[PDB]
Amino acid sequence: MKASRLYTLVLVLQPQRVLLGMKKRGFGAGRWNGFGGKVQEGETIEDGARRELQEESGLTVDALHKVGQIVFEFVGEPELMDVHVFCTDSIQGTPVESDEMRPCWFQLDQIPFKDMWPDDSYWFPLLLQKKKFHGYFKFQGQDTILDYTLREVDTV
Numbered sequence: 603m604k605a606s607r608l609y610t611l612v613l614v615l616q617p618q619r620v621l622l623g624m625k626k627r628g629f630g631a632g633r634w635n636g637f638g639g640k641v642q643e644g645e646t647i648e649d650g651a652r653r654e655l656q657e658e659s660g661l662t663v664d665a666l667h668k669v670g671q672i673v674f675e676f677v678g679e680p681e682l683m684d685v686h687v688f689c690t691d692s693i694q695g696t697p698v699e700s701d702e703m704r705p706c707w708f709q710l711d712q713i714p715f716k717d718m719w720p721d722d723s724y725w726f727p728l729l730l731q732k733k734k735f736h737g738y739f740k741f742q743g744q745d746t747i748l749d750y751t752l753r754e755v756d757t758v
């Protein structure tokens with residue numbers, strides 16, 4: 603049995619494009635990723651996801667919808683990352699570059715999988731098909747999956 607820490611991940615997914623952020627520093631630097639971070643005490647997971655989206659991208663949203671949950675385990679780290687994945691309902695402002703993320707839009711036939719976390723290649727297509735999912739991925743370092751599980755679910 604491990605302990606888990608709560609994280610969020612928000613995909614700003616529109617009919618023909620997705621907003622991703624180029625991580626400028628820290629965990630997963632150099633890759634494109636959705637927007638998110640650690641849930642804080644007292645806030646709901648959804649509200650933490652909205653907060654992190656605003657802090658990281660500049661976008662404010664009134665509501666999200668949950669699309670998945672992914673547990674990440676890293677060799678040499680006993681704590682699991684329990685990542686709650688959301689998609690935006692609608693957006694109403696422009697993304698802003700920050701110290702941590704440079705946002706950029708990608709057309710949905712140009713999803714930059716080779717420059718994203720390797721697990722995204724498995725679960726992001728489900729997000730595009732509007733399918734909810736549970737996943738688990740064990741990593742050696744940042745590049746190598748040693749074990750994983752991915753399941754479509756009716757309820758996240």
Ligand SMILES: Nc1[nH]c(=O)nc2c1ncn2[C@H]1C[C@H](O)[C@@H](COP(=O)(O)OP(=O)(O)OP(=O)(O)O)O1
Nearest residue numbers: 609610611629635637638639640674685719721722
């Ligand atoms: N394998 C992976 N695949 C993926 O798509 N996103 C991942 C991922 N591993 C981590 N992430 C995402 C989840 C979360 O949005 C972010 C990690 O959160 P951070 O540790 O950057 O959070 P915080 O910025 O709150 O932490 P602090 O540095 O303590 O402020 O990266």
Ligand SMILES: [Mn+2]
Nearest residue numbers: 638639654658
């Ligand atoms: Mn953050």
Ligand SMILES: [Mn+2]
Nearest residue numbers: 638639658702
């Ligand atoms: Mn972050």
Ligand code: NA
Nearest residue numbers: 638639640654
């Ligand atoms: Na944070």
Ligand code: NA
Nearest residue numbers: 628638639702
């Ligand atoms: Na961060």
